[model samples]
Target: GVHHYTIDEFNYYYKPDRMTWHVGEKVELTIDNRSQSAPPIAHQFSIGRTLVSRDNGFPKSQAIAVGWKDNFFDGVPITSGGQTGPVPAFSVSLNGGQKYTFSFVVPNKPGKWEYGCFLQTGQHFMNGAHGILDILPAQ
Candidate 1:
């Protein structure tokens, strides 16, 4: 079946900052960026197995590219810039007051995954522009 999700970033925060899905479901994800912030303050969505730490006492995390839809791009390189994320995953350019939608299929895997808008890769993300995708076993 089809599902819906709205992710937004602005005023130093993200919206609908969490989600849950079942394996084999279609996700109608929508992103709305109302961030008045300028100069690459845009936001995009991406999923990773885990996200790494800032080497500043925070736990490490990274993407777990094991899905079918929107699997082309996982997350940043854990280095300089994340110029490697794929469709719907840091692929779309969402500036302030901009909105974009895309379709994705929930992989047939059951586990907890991370999703966030990594336009700035580390900065905004580390600041807290992210969420989680909890994939439970199909029922």
Candidate 2:
């Protein structure tokens, strides 16, 4: 089955998991973060031949292949087009009651990919922010 992604970003509620798309087939992502006091954070699904972030810290040179790089806060925030991050770098910040959407062409090659929010702000991700995207074998 092809995997879809929903994250704790603009919306607080975990979106209904929808199994859509085909192996090696690209798909769009829809995320809705609804947490009022969650400080408006960014979410991600980092996948690669290596790990960008770890228990210690982001490696010296790991890169984010894809995921939510939208990070912002109420009132004070990052500017437009200035926010673009994958992992082993920075995070995307979203404002209260904001919505974000994007369509990424999953790598042509297939492999079991692990993804999630890459925020090591005093142990926040450890609280269930990561997700696994099992890139199915070629159909």
Candidate 3:
């Protein structure tokens, strides 16, 4: 069966901070960036193995920090506005009021994954812009 979920990205947080899925299930996840902060910053939705630790108030590595291992969107197709295509990368970026949707069959890996927005020099992530993705074993 297909499961649908929506994540709303505010100034520095994602609503409904937790999500769950079953291995092999089809997932249609939509992310809406609703941030209306001054200067209208962009936000990214990225899910990965773990949150990279910081040193001296900075991420050890920005690339690895924003990238994912065993990415949930691996092999998945994505749609934004009216265009549809393979996901170019693990993370999706959107300006305020923009939205993107991802459709894919959940990988057969069951465990806890971390998701976050590592924008603004990682301040967004450090300031409560992270969440968890729990993939349960198939029954």
Query: Which residues of candidate 1, in runs, are more than 4 Å off?
Result: 38-40, 53-90
Kindly report which residue stretches of model 3 are placed more than 4 angstroms away from their true locations once superposed: 54-70, 76-88
- Predicted structure 1, TM vs. truth: 0.65
The sequence of per-residue lDDT tens digits that candidate 1 reaches over residues 1-139 is 5777777767455677777888767776677778775553666656666555434455547432222244423432221133322333445557777787766566676787776555543566657766777888876
Q: Tell me the lDDT of candidate 1.
A: 0.60
- TM-score (C-alpha) between model 3 and the true structure: 0.79
Candidate 2 lDDT, tens digit per residue, 8-60?
A: 45222233322333454545454555655646554443332334333445563
Error of 2 at 122 (Å): 5.7
> Of the pair 1 and 2, which is ahead by TM-score?
1
Candidate 1 residue-wise lDDT at 41? 63
What is the alpha-carbon lDDT of model 2 when measured against the actual structure?
A: 0.42
> 33-135 in candidate 3: lDDT tens per residue?
9897877779998887755554565555443244445566666666555767667566878998888876777777689987888787777886788899998
After the best TM-score superposition of candidate 1, give how far the Cα of residue 129 lies from its true spot, in angstroms.
1.4
Cα error, residue 49 of model 3, in Å, equals 1.0
Cα RMSD (Å) per model? 8.5, 9.8, 3.9
